[PDB]
Design a protein around this ligand. Structure first.
Ligand SMILES: [Zn+2]
Ligand SMILES: [Zn+2]
Lengths: 286, 57, 69, 57, 196, 443, 106, 65, 134, 283, 44
RNA sequence: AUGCGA
């Protein structure tokens, strides 16, 4: 269960995971993920499906992996050819990014499962209900935003950047590859240059970090608070540092560092601070 | 650089005398309780390894 | 919390250069580099002290319980 | 800890005179040993150093 | 940490050769003719045959691994201190690995050369039932990278598709690391009781 | 110029916080998936999710053993009690007693007092007597429900940043969490089976159920409109027999699937066969398994000749446990079971559509058995959805109100079993029972 | 090469019914037609009886309201279709055995 | 109707009791009244086959590519 | 019965000219079935490209559509009467529907051609040269 | 090993030294010649035509080529005759009886075979065999209407994987891995010394080794199990290229052998120790 | 041996898992003991 | 117990 699966791409952060017993159990959502809290336009979807060539389930009177099943929220509404399966999936996604199909909310998740030898059981399982995990990707045919869920994502060719878009393949592209990272992983500068598990220990530090808890501290009464008074804004930051406003609650400070073994007390895990610097108030906390 | 709240520096503890549980009369638990660290089974065995039987007693 | 008195690394008094610097970014519409150059923070220890500052006290000060609101 | 999950305790508060001083006339706030990087591959920290220095200058 | 222009020249030139390696191994393990098009329909059906077989897919991983790992070995052996921007009696990274203060030649090559082929539980990257190791990869992508072979290095960064794999290896490392110590306590106490 | 400092902009925002809109809309938008979850218990279709929940709890019927001297065993007068609406009010505090005017209660208050941040939970009770002989309305106060901060039920739901400062809060306070006894607690989001969709799974528990069990099985987690769930599993026995599994009162139950088929709609064996294989007339594998299934049921229950008899058999066989005897016939208990168990995500009267979907589940199950389709992975994010804490809040509310009515019925049962002192009509009895159970479910 | 349409007949006459694979019915069984005029649309219900069972059929309203069926009769030699609107009715037939029940309880 | 080894009642669609086991001329439905063992006698046969799975082997493996 | 008052009895039916141009096994006449979304008004048609057999592209108010044609299930070239797509034939406004046939064989017949109107969509291709900028 | 001393290893192996004179090709021939061969393992296709008054199962088993399975598994069609007519049919017929309880060309010599097998087996009626290669085996099975229904494909499959052309009890496979750092050997996936004892003309029996401690103790006695434990564990560390003094491992083995057996270190092995408190302080 | 998380008896006493014998006999808390974060030093 | 240094 702890195995990191590729399905989570765009949904859960591959690095926001605690280290230890909880590892793999406590996932963290991507910073660009949304959660369905409602359901819509299920009422018009049968009408348009009927227009697209779906045979009414009372009338089809046939069933099998040899045929595509159109279902909505576990309401099987009809049957088509697998070819019409693909025609419907693509033309439907077109009317989703369009604004012309009011019975068709942008956020409907269109599960196409093509026919596959011993593959996933075929079908076109649409979903619009609650608690769906949904994330934006850029739909190229309309050069406009499209919401994709984890079910349909498996079978969708999403180029990671526009220059890597392969011809006749990627139907969407990532808006930004940061869209696959969680908040903390985007908050770590150049986190894409370190060994992953050191990035995860970075998440554990920022998560376990003594910082600025608030400014209403004169109106809270915690059993404990740690408030660093000498707070600064990193010189080096992600632009999401501003976009998520972590500058409101700075948790550290920009320090003059020498990368040097010299004193002989600087080994393995021990680092030296300037004494006069602390005397000037360096890292003073309460 | 960020200062972690875990000033495990603050976690220092020393006990040369303290309370004991009445059901054992053995050192109680916890730094804030002036409790006494446990010499567990592995530390007992390990001290037998050293031959330090007068230290183990 | 509040503009540090001195640059931790160097030792140069810096607390005098805050309001003018903020004024110089306002009043002089200058850029941070040139503003600090006119302020004399010619060391990155003194550069960083003010450049990185977050005078969060303005956010603290609105919680003052000693005046009606 | 730095922004790189390379956490370490402060072993001692070195007197400022005893620190090394650059020809720029400064002595660092924090000194981190280089041999920590080769296992950790914290090279994001190297770039963070060179970018934060550039960005201050 | 820098290489010469030369060392990056050999590195880039050798790293140009993995493109054939990916499918060449895919058609060898599939046991199909040389240069078989990466889009042969029979290739796709056979590759689905491998997808549905855990054992065949494991062999495909292992063989692709041997070949691309031979490419890694090549890269490092060529570029080594033979391409570093500054050498030994100066290059501190070389000093630490070669002295064995910390690191291995593996770490130094992972910074300066490439991460190389990631593995999990003993084999290459998991594949979705769609035949894809990432949304961005078409089903059955024969690229080694799509199998998880990362050509990027810490000095020049890793592509995002590549960060998802080094993240896989890093997690599986942290899991094994967190359970392995719990599997040794009972081994200790169970027989330490007897020989005391 | 890539991540430039917002320095004048920031310091302006510190000095003069927004009076109209928080900055960092990602910051408020990130915990948005929680808040929306809590608001859907108070606003939405009809009145929000919670009113659908009380629409699902239905009725709780009790008969005074109406003596009457059929009028002496056909109803000691029906009394069906239910709940029409459930209302939640924003935290208010009355001073001393109640004869005072209430004040809106603010979170700053709950934290400084180090106490819960409670709202009075009210629900419009419907007291239906003799199927309609007497209707009684009651707005009942159900104690203090911990309200989510910044919810459609927290005063800070609609406060501008400036106002937020005026209420001693972090100018950007996201909320979404609960102040209970001063301790900020949130409900952990959970990963659950993607709702309403058949997941083909091979599980060794499935063989562990007993003899003749295979590994193969289908699991669909039907979720009701109100988001309460009911998991249904299909198991293929080694004998070709297929059994339908469900869980009631957290006990598991197995029934032959052909029984639930003849139970949904009256149909011929040729109609079920036609339902499954269709044009696929060539699966001797499927033809034969289906002859074993249908012929085997025809062997076991030769006397179940029609759907109605089946309904009487199911209601009759669980009537002891569905608490609908002293009033309903085995046909009614059976039908309420069908509506309450089988693909409840499809809802009442979806029984032919529920039938078709069930046929789809049989077809997929045999596609797994033969091996013509891959198995799915419950643990792939592909096959998973997220139970939001607030939704759990709504499920647990529904359960708490169902139990609360259960307590009413228990109170009537004891009174009728120890006194029969008072008629279902007495207002004294309504107030008295209400005054004899404790009902602050808020606590 | 496309077949042209000569004439269209638009009013109710013929109907179509989906049934079990094997339907044959008595040599004479009769089919009672019904009509519903709802605002600006007719929903149809068919009802028949036989010697043991009775067959009743109705329209799938959610597909009926969202899809409409057309029938035509073509002659190759006349190139002409007589069009007929027909409701498709998924009908089930209950028997007298399907009309027996126990007491409402034990 | 008879299908494969199933024979459904022609009147009701019930898979009526197998002609091979009737104690009579034909058969009759328990839902319908159609006569079984007297009408169509059927000649029930099925070409059942192996699933091409029970028998993995090196020889199958050389036969599988 | 004539139930759900929302229903009416029938009063107007039509004779079926099964044999006015029929000849026993000699006229190759046919009956076709086409499925039409309710959104289209069939009565406002004039001809039907059902004759394309496969090339059933179709133009409904100058709008282009494609007509999916099926050749099984109800018309399967495989089993004797492989279809339940029952035909119910009337006769007169004073008579109940009848089972289609072509002689007195207890024979339920089938539709010679089954058609289905499928909604076409532009689904225009992505302009790769503009999007895949480096 | 150490903790449970399980007498049923997960990967029981027996190492076989092959004589210097034993050719590599002869050795691979022997490797094929000893491995077990299941009846399923030779089956290509199974077609069951159940036709029903007697319930008829006409089972046509279209096999592989005689020479194909004869060159992969060194077995004949005649061996298939004996196994089918004796093993396969008898076991399937027993499984059919079990299913009832669950319910409740054609030459004279061939005709004599069919009649004889019918005479040995109650269910079978006809027997047609591909005597020209062995490519198939057709036999007619007749059952009473009262037989109702079975999944004959599934029954056949189950009997197919339970019939063996060649089986060494407990021994599965002999492989020819490449020799390295030692004498040429074959590693078997099973443990049966007595069976290799007959193979002496290819294997220097004095040099047989195994990963099964219990099998060694039962066969070669306490000193061999002792050396097997210390060698096997030493191999366990050698895999991780760890140095461990041999004195430790050999001591540990002696403690596992303190009674002359394979006395594990859990509570069960502790029981026989004399300190009751030492037992008290474990479990 | 009775008939819910009942109060433990003497058997679910010093035995079972950690208990007394394991958690207070074979290993104990002790006086004259300290715990602290360790720091390097080459001059000692 | 949970979380935690790890
Ligand atoms: Zn300075
Ligand atoms: Zn019948």
């Amino acid at each position: 269960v702890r195995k990191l699966l590729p399905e989570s791409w765009g949904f859960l952060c591959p690095v926001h995971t605690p280290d230890g017993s909880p590892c793999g159990l406590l996932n963290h959502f991507a910073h660009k993920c949304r959660i369905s809290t409602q359901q819509s336009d299920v009422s018009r979807i049968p009408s348009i499906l009927y227009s697209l060539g779906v045979a009414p389930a009372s009338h089809t009177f046939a069933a099998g992996p040899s045929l595509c099943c159109v279902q909505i929220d576990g309401k099987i509404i009809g049957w088509v050819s697998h070819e019409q399966g693909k025609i419907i999936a693509d033309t439907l996604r077109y009317w989703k990014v369009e604004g012309k199909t009011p019975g068709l909310p942008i956020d409907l998740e269109i599960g196409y499962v093509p026919p596959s030898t011993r593959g996933q059981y075929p079908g076109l399982y649409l979903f619009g209900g609650h608690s769906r995990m949904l994330r934006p990707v850029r739909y190229l045919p309309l050069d406009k935003e499209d919401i994709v869920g984890p079910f349909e994502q498996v079978y969708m060719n999403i180029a990671v950047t526009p220059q890597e878009i392969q011809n006749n393949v990627h139907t969407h592209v990532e808006f930004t590859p940061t869209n696959i990272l969680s908040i903390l992983a985007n908050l770590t500068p150049f986190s894409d240059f370190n060994q992953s598990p050191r990035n995860m220990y970075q998440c554990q530090m920022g998560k376990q970090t003594m910082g600025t808890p608030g400014v209403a501290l004169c109106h809270r009464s915690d059993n404990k608070l740690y408030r660093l008074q000498t707070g600064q804004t990193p010189i080096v930051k992600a632009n999401l540092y501003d976009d998520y406003g972590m500058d409101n609650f700075p948790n550290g400070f920009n320090a003059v560092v020498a990368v040097i073994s010299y004193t002989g007390y600087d080994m393995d895990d021990a680092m030296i601070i300037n004494k006069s610097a602390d005397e000037r108030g360096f890292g003073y906390g309460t | 650089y960020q200062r972690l709240r875990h000033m495990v520096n603050d976690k220092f503890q020393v006990r040369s005398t303290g309370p004991v549980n009445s059901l054992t009369m053995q050192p109680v638990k916890g730094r804030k309780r002036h409790g006494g660290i446990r010499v567990g089974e592995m530390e007992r065995d390990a001290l037998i390894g050293h031959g330090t039987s007068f230290l183990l007693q | 919390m509040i503009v540090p008195v001195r640059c931790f690394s160097c030792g140069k008094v810096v607390g005098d250069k805050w309001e003018s610097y903020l004024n110089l970014l306002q009043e002089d519409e200058l850029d941070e580099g040139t503003a600090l150059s006119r302020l004399g923070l010619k060391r990155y220890c003194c550069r960083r002290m003010i450049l990185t500052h977050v005078d969060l006290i303005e956010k603290f000060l609105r919680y003052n319980p000693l005046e009606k609101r | 800890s730095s922004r790189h999950g390379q956490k370490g305790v402060c072993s001692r508060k070195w007197p400022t005179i005893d620190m090394p001083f650059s020809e720029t006339g400064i002595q660092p706030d924090i000194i981190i040993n280089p041999h920590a990087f080769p296992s950790r591959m914290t090279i994001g920290m190297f770039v963070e150093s060179l970018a934060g220095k550039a960005g201050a200058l | 940490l820098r290489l010469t222009a030369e060392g990056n020249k050999w590195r880039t030139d050798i790293l140009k050769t993995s493109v054939d390696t990916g499918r060449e191994a895919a058609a060898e393990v599939t046991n199909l003719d040389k240069d078989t098009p990466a889009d042969d329909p029979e290739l796709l059906k056979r590759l689905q045959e491998i997808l549905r077989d855990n054992n065949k897919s494991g062999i495909l991983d292992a063989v692709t691994s041997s070949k691309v790992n031979a490419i890694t070995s090549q890269v490092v052996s060529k570029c080594v201190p033979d391409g570093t921007m500054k050498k030994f009696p100066c290059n501190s990274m070389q000093a630490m690995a070669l002295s064995g203060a910390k690191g291995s030649n593996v770490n130094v090559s992972q910074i300066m050369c490439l991460l190389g082929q990631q593995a999990l539980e003993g084999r290459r990257v998991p594949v979705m039932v769609s035949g894809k190791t990432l949304p961005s990869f078409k089903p059955y992508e024969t690229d080694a990278m799509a199998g998880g072979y990362v050509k990027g290095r810490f000095y020049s960064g890793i592509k995002p598709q590549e960060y998802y794999f080094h993240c896989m290896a890093g997690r599986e490392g942290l899991i094994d690391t967190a359970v392995k110590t719990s599997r040794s306590g009972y081994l200790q106490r169970c027989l330490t009781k007897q020989l005391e | 110029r890539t991540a430039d400092f917002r320095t004048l902009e920031r310091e302006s925002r510190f000095i003069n916080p927004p009076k109209d809109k928080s900055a960092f809309p990602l910051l408020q938008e990130a915990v948005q998936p929680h808040i929306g979850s809590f608001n859907a218990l108070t606003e939405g279709p009809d009145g929000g999710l919670l009113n659908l929940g009380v629409k699902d709890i239905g009725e709780k019927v009790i008969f005074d053993g109406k003596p009457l001297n059929s009028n002496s065993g056909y109803l000691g007068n029906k009394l069906s009690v239910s709940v029409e609406q459930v209302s939640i009010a924003k935290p208010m505090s009355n001073d001393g007693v109640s004869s005072a005017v209430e004040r809106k209660v603010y979170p700053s208050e709950s934290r400084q007092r180090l106490t819960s941040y409670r709202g009075k939970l009210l629900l419009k009770l419907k007291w239906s007597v003799n199927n309609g002989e007497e209707n009684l309305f009651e707005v009942r106060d159900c104690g203090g429900l911990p309200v989510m901060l910044q919810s459609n039920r927290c005063h800070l739901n609609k406060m501008s940043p400036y106002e937020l400062v005026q209420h001693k809060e972090e100018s950007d306070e996201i909320g979404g969490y609960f102040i209970v006894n001063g301790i900020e607690k949130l409900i952990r989001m959970l990963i659950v089976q993607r709702r309403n969709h058949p997941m083909a799974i091979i599980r060794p528990s499935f063989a562990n159920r007993g003899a003749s069990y295979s590994h193969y099985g289908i699991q669909i987690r039907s979720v009701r409109p109100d988001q309460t769930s009911q998991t249904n599993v299909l198991h293929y026995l080694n004998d070709g027999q297929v059994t339908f599994r469900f869980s009631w009162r957290k006990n598991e139950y197995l029934v032959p699937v052909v029984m639930i088929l003849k139970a949904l709609c009256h149909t011929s064996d040729r109609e079920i066969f036609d339902g499954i294989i269709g044009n696929d007339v060539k699966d001797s594998f499927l033809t034969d398994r289906l002859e074993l299934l249908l012929r085997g049921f025809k062997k076991r229950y030769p006397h179940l000749q029609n759907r109605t008899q089946v309904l009487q058999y199911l209601g009759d066989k669980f009537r002891v446990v569905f608490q609908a005897s002293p009033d309903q016939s085995d046909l009614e208990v059976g039908q309420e079971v069908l509506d309450r168990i089988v693909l409840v995500h499809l809802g009442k009267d979806g029984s032919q559509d529920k039938f078709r979907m069930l046929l789809f589940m049989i077809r997929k199950l045999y596609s797994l058995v033969a091996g013509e389709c891959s198995p799915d992975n419950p643990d792939a994010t592909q096959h998973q959805e997220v139970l939001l804490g607030g939704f759990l809040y709504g499920m647990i509310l529904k359960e708490k109100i169902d139990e609360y009515l259960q307590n009413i019925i228990a109170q009537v049962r004891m009174d009728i079993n120890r006194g029969m002192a008072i008629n279902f009509k007495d207002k004294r009895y309504m107030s008295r029972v209400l005054m004899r159970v404790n009902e602050n479910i808020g606590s | 090469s496309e077949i042209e349409i000569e004439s269209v007949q638009d009013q109710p006459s013929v109907a179509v019914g989906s049934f079990f694979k094997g339907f044959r019915a008595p040599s004479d069984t009769t089919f009672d037609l019904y009509k519903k005029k709802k605002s600006e649309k007719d929903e149809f219900v068919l009802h028949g009886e036989n010697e043991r069972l009775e067959y009743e059929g109705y329209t799938d309203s959610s597909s009926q309201a969202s899809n409409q069926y057309v029938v035509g009769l073509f002659n190759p030699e006349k190139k002409s279709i007589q069009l007929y609107k027909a409701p498709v009715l998924v009908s089930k037939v209950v028997s007298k055995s399907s009309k027996n029940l126990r007491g409402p309880k034990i | 109707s008879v299908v494969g080894s199933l024979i459904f009642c022609l009147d009701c669609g019930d898979l009526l009791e197998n002609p091979n086991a009737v104690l009579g001329s034909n058969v009759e439905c328990s839902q319908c009244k159609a006569i079984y063992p007297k009408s169509q006698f059927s000649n029930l046969k099925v070409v059942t086959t192996t699933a091409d799975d029970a028998f993995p082997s090196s020889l199958r493996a050389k036969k599988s590519v | 019965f004539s139930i759900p008052d929302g229903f009416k009895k029938c009063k107007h039916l039509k004779n079926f000219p099964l044999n006015g141009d029929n000849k026993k096994k000699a006229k190759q006449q046919q009956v076709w079935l086409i499925k039409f979304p309710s959104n289209v008004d069939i009565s406002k048609l004039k001809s039907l490209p059902v004759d394309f057999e496969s090339s059933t592209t179709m133009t409904i108010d100058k709008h282009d559509y494609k007509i999916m044609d099926d050749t099984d299930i109800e018309s399967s070239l495989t089993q004797d009467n492989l279809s339940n797509m029952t035909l119910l034939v009337p006769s007169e406004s004073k008579e109940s529907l009848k089972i289609a046939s072509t002689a007195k064989d207890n024979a339920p017949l089938q539709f010679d051609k089954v058609f289905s109107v499928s909604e076409t969509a532009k689904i225009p291709a992505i302009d790769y040269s503009k999007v895949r900028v480096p | 090993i150490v903790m449970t001393a399980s007498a049923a290893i997960k990967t029981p192996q027996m190492t076989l030294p092959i004589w210097n004179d034993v050719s590599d090709e002869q050795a691979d021939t022997f490797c094929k010649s000893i491995s077990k061969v299941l009846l399923s393992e030779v089956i290509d296709k199974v077609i069951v035509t159940e036709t029903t008054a007697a319930r008829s199962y006409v089972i046509h088993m279209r096999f592989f080529d005689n020479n194909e399975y004869s060159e992969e598994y060194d077995v004949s069609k005649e061996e298939l005759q004996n196994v089918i007519s004796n093993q396969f049919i008898h076991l399937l017929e027993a499984a059919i009886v079990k299913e009832i309880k669950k319910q409740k060309n054609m030459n004279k010599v061939q005709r004599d075979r069919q009649s004889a097998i019918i005479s040995h087996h109650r269910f079978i009626t006809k027997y047609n065999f591909d005597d020209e290669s062995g490519k198939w085996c057709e036999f007619k099975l007749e059952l009473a209407a009262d037989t109702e229904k079975l999944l004959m494909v599934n029954i056949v499959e189950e009997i197919c994987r339970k019939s063996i052309i060649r089986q060494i009890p407990h021994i599965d496979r002999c492989v020819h891995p490449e020799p390295e750092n030692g004498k040429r050997v074959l590693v078997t996936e099973g443990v049966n010394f007595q069976a290799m004892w007959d193979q002496e003309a290819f294997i220097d029996v004095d040099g047989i080794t195994s990963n099964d401690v219990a099998a060694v103790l039962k066969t070669y006695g306490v000193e061999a199990a002792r050396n097997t434990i210390v060698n096997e564990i030493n191999n366990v560390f050698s895999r991780y290229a760890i140095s461990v003094s041999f004195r430790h491992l050999d001591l540990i083995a002696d403690m596992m052998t303190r009674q002359g057996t394979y006395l594990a270190f859990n509570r069960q092995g502790m029981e026989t120790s004399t300190s009751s408190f030492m037992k008290m302080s474990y479990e | 041996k009775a008939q819910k998380v009942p109060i433990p008896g003497v058997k679910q006493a010093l035995e079972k898992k950690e208990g007394l014998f394991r958690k207070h006999m074979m290993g104990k808390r002790v006086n004259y003991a300290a715990r602290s974060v360790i720091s390097p030093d080459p001059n000692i």
